[PDB]
């Protein structure tokens, strides 16, 4: 039962978040060049490493 809801949730999450990229000035922006975050997480640190 929960599979369908989880899949739909993941798809719409991706639709909302799909185009956000760290830039060479370190800001997180949109496709339209709208600056949503000035530094990633207020830190600029990649959570992976």
């Amino acid at each position: 039962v929960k599979t369908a809801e989880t899949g739909y949730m993941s798809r719409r999450l991706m639709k909302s978040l799909e185009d956000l990229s760290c830039q060479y000035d370190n800001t997180v922006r949109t496709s339209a060049n709208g600056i949503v975050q000035f530094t990633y997480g207020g830190d600029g640190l990649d959570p992976l490493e």
Partner: protein, 215 residues
Amino acid sequence: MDQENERNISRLWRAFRTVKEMVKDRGYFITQEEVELPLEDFKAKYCDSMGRPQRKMMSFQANPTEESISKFPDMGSLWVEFCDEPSVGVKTMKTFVIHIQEKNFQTGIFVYQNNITPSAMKLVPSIPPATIETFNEAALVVNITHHELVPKHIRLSSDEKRELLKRYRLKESQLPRIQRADPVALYLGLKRGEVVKIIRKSETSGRYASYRICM
């Protein structure tokens, strides 16, 4: 009722204090003893001898401080005007607008009590040079700025906004936006195109600075 009267007076005193500090941090001169008034002093100085409050002893005026006028040269005096009639109509609002224009203020807030009519709201944005800022009274009991969830918003001048834009090579249409008629935006009295600096603190990153623009 006696306890109902006591509760009304307590709420009125707290609202008076909130308005006092709101006018303070906006950049107008009030003093720490002026804001840190005791409840007994409030009752003895702003109430009649019958045993009721009187809103008309409280309508006061503020003036720009030296540093505030140095930073924002085009800032005039305001006029806080508490009201006694519960449901404000066009008569009281028209009288208020005439008083504002005859006293030639640059701004002036209006702390109504119970309700504001849709017709009175239509006279609020009708003055070419100046503007009025209608405020409820049930809203002002606890100031928003002192809540734990509200980061310290700071207003930027024209020079500082230009400095921010030049640093990131940005355009004002691209900064994140703060709605006009936002509880913290109207607290500071934000006009369109004003940049507000925010100091938000995260446990995973300490303190970092973000920015917004009034929209």
